[PDB]
Design a protein around this ligand. Structure first.
Ligand SMILES: [Cu+2]
Length: 105
């Protein structure tokens, strides 16, 4: 199936759930918003095993998360390089809202 990180605890603060993530090279991962939007999901082109700027083009999205309960299901491509990615939030940056996809090799 696909992995999903319900960012935002509920009575504590904002933090992906879980914080890290383990997927395969091409698996799918759905991200959503809780009750403290807007949330921004993207993959920095510096915290990756292949510092580049292509697989992200079809991975990171834009526009604020105006959907309460869902953000954007990024279907990682078959090029997903093993190692560990690193996405974060633009607004909730001071809330440990920084997760990372771990695609074993
Ligand atoms: Cu967020």
């Amino acid at each position: 199936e696909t992995y999903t990180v319900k960012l935002g605890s509920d009575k504590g603060l904002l933090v992906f759930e879980p914080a890290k993530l383990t997927i395969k090279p091409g698996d799918t991962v759905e991200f959503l918003n809780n009750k403290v939007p807007p949330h921004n999901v993207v993959f920095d082109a510096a915290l990756n095993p292949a510092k580049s700027a292509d697989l992200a083009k079809s991975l990171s999205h834009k526009q604020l998360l105006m959907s309460p309960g869902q953000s954007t299901s990024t279907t990682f491509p078959a090029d997903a390089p093993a190692g560990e990615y690193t996405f974060y939030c633009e607004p909730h940056r001071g809330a440990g809202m920084v997760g990372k996809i771990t695609v074993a090799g």
